Structure formats: structure tokens, C-alpha cells
């Protein structure tokens, strides 16, 4: 999550899109926009072990 909110051409898959094979596309994310997706078991493993 600390990677994604830097100015980088990485971390996207715009090379799978049409014109994105050559050239560059840099982007960021706002951290009010990133959401993560796991199980509820890993949610429990957060809420009991680390935090």
C-alpha cells in the first residue's frame, strides 16, 4: 500500500491494453481509493495476531 501511492509506471497492466505495448503510463493511488480483498479467516488473523 506504500508502494502504490508513488509516481510509478509499474503496478498496472496497461501493456495488456491496446496501445500500451510500447510507451509508458505512470499513475498513483490515493489510499482513500485502495481496498483490499481477502478471506474472513485472514481478516481474523489480522485482528487477533498483529493489531
Amino acid at each position: 500500500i506504500l508502494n502504490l501511492q508513488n509516481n510509478s509506471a509499474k503496478y498496472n497492466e496497461v501493456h495488456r491494453a491496446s496501445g500500451g505495448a510500447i510507451g509508458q503510463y505512470t499513475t498513483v493511488s490515493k489510499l482513500k481509493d485502495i481496498v483490499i480483498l481477502t478471506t474472513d479467516s485472514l481478516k481474523s488473523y489480522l485482528l487477533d495476531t498483529k493489531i
Binding site: 474472513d40 479467516s41 481478516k43 481474523s44 488473523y45 485482528l47 487477533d48
Partner: protein
């Protein structure tokens, strides 16, 4: 005293019989998608926390 024990035994038999009924329900009544398999008492606390 015999009157108060003849009302207290009502309480203890009612809680014991109803405890018996939901434990008896917790065997041989509900299917394998409900039941999960733990292994220890130092397990089954994480497993109830994800449960």
C-alpha cells in the same frame, strides 16, 4: 426449605434438559458444512474467532 428445594430443582432440571437438547442437536442433526474440525484448546480460539 423443602418448598424452596422443590422450586430450585425445577430450575436445575430445566437448564440441564435444555442444555442437553442443544448439545444433542449439536450431534447427529446438522450437516458437515456446518461443523468444522479443530485440534486443540490452543486451537479453536482462533477458529472460533474466525467462526
Amino acid at each position: 426449605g423443602v418448598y424452596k428445594k422443590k422450586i430450585s430443582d425445577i430450575n436445575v432440571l430445566e437448564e440441564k434438559e435444555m442444555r442437553a437438547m442443544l448439545v444433542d442437536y449439536s450431534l447427529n442433526q446438522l450437516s458437515e458444512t456446518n461443523v468444522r474440525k479443530a485440534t486443540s484448546k490452543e486451537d479453536l480460539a482462533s477458529k472460533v474467532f474466525e467462526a
